[PDB]
Design goal:
It is classed as immune system. The complex is a heterodimer of chains A (222) and B (213). Chain A is mainly β. Chain A contains no helices and 20 strands. In chain A, 0% of the residues lie in helices and 51% in strands. Chain B is elongated, with a radius of gyration of 23 Å. Classes of the chains: A mainly beta (222), B mainly beta (213). The complex binds nicotinamide-adenine-dinucleotide.
Chain lengths: 222, 213
């Protein structure tokens, strides 16, 4: 199985620098051309940079919008491709995908993306509060519970339930920017009302930019 | 550079029907058009290479055709699993470019939301703020109205909504509405109520609690 795994995203001030990494497995890395492709609401999917094989001088190519600011490199001994970004702009904000292109044709494998935010605001880790079920959160045989993940910056946060064992019925809402400039979101799940007080429900919140890793047990109230 | 135009940008089809996505190139690209599917929170997945060649493991209901400048991705029978954004990409010449994407919505029968209200946690109240959350779960169509009433006084300017993308398993939406007050203002009132109207509800649904019970 081919896997591509990016890392290094986060928050940086305008004009700043940041290096993204991607580690590949499942193909002969040194033979293939590694790419970064970014995605934003405004520009959609956008090819950023490519580095080809060492056999053809590890040749690099850049989109015109990043040329002179970004440098793509590879370490074949680590099966790694890197994107060193400098002089970053607000409009460089977006999700950055590691991707293989098959010798100038399809992007036939993609990573999961790593998020870059270019902004002058500061990192802030969230507070996590339970959305506690009762009877006004019980619709017959179904109850709802959740976690409120409030006042953080930048995007993203990830929320899992019971360390990933619970995925059915989960809704993690898009984050909303509050007037304070901080994000907030809720993650909810619907469960059998009979399971309240007999099954444990824990939301696992991770906000990497603040090194926040919180597990919140959500219990019915008093 | 070659511009790929995907129009319409939004398609809505009933389950079981055929749908076609359009990708038009501003210059000749031969057959070098590739199609990708990107589900919500997911990565692009290559479906069709070179206009018509479906990748291994792609369901047989996906096909592609076209050459020159006019290309079509087709899904013969549409299931809710096909809810996604669909992108074309050319590799006829450098730099490679992508279309802006077309979103697929899959219609379904009307589904009224299940409604739930959540008081603010004791934990958050110690921090001087109260968030009250109203959840509308698994409804269709997307249009819904949520109103906050505090001792029957209609609230304005102190709530925000968030809606999920359409669910690829049941074609529904879910919505959260969060009312934010200072603790001082929260403790000045008793009845907190979320009132919901939706095409599937024969009369508006109110979920409420009394502060401290
Ligand atoms: N001249 C060709 O190699 C050629 C010609 C036509 C078609 N193809 C197709 O291309 C596909 C893959 O070809 P391929 O050569 O890229 O890999 P491969 O899958 O054919 O690998 C075969 C073996 O060659 C060695 N190899 C390949 N690259 C190496 C490297 N950098 N360092 C050390 N050993 C290496 C490895 O031992 C590898 O297990 C195959 O499916 C083949 O059918 C290749």
């Amino acid at each position: 199985e081919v896997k591509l795994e990016e890392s290094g995203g986060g928050l940086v001030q305008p004009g700043g620098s940041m290096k993204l990494s991607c580690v590949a497995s499942g193909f002969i890395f040194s033979n293939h051309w590694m790419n970064w492709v970014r995605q934003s609401p405004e520009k959609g999917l956008e090819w950023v940079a490519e580095i080809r094989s060492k056999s053809i001088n590890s040749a690099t190519h850049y989109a015109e919008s990043v040329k002179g600011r970004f440098t793509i490199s590879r370490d074949d001994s680590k099966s790694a491709v890197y994107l060193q970004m400098t002089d970053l702009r607000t409009e460089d904000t977006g999700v950055y995908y590691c991707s293989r292109n098959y010798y100038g044709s399809t992007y036939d494998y993609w990573g999961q993306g790593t998020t870059l935010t270019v902004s002058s605001a500061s990192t802030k880790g969230p507070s996590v509060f339970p959305l506690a079920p009762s009877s006004k959160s019980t619709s017959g045989g179904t109850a709802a519970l959740g976690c409120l993940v409030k006042d953080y910056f930048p995007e993203p946060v990830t929320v899992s339930w019971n360390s990933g064992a619970l995925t059915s019925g989960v809704h993690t809402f898009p984050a909303v920017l509050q007037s304070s400039g901080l994000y907030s979101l809720s993650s909810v799940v619907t469960v059998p009302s009979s399971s309240l007080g007999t099954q444990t429900y824990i939301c696992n919140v991770n906000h990497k930019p603040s090194n926040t890793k919180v597990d919140k047990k959500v219990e019915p109230k008093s | 550079d070659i511009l790929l135009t995907q129009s319409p940008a939004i398609l809505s089809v009933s389950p079981g029907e055929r749908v076609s996505f359009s990708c038009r190139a501003s210059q000749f690209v031969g057959s070098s058009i590739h199609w990708y599917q990107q589900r919500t929170n997911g990565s692009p997945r290559l479906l069709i290479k070179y206009a018509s060649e479906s990748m291994s493991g792609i369901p047989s209901r996906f096909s592609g055709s076209g050459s020159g400048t006019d290309f079509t991705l087709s899904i013969n029978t549409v299931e809710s699993e096909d809810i996604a954004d669909y992108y074309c990409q050319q590799s006829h010449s450098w730099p490679f470019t992508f279309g802006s994407g077309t979103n697929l919505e899959v219609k379904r029968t009307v589904a009224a939301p299940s409604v739930f209200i959540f008081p603010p946690s004791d934990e958050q109240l110690k921090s001087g703020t109260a968030s009250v959350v109203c959840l509308l779960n698994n409804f269709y169509p997307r249009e819904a109205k949520v109103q906050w009433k505090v001792d029957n006084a209609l609230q304005s300017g102190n709530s925000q909504e968030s809606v999920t993308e359409q669910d690829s398993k049941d074609s529904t939406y879910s919505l959260s509405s969060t009312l934010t007050l200072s603790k001082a203002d929260y403790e000045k009132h008793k009845v907190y109520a979320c009132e919901v109207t939706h095409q599937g509800l024969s009369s508006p649904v109110t979920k409420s609690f009394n502060r401290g019970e």
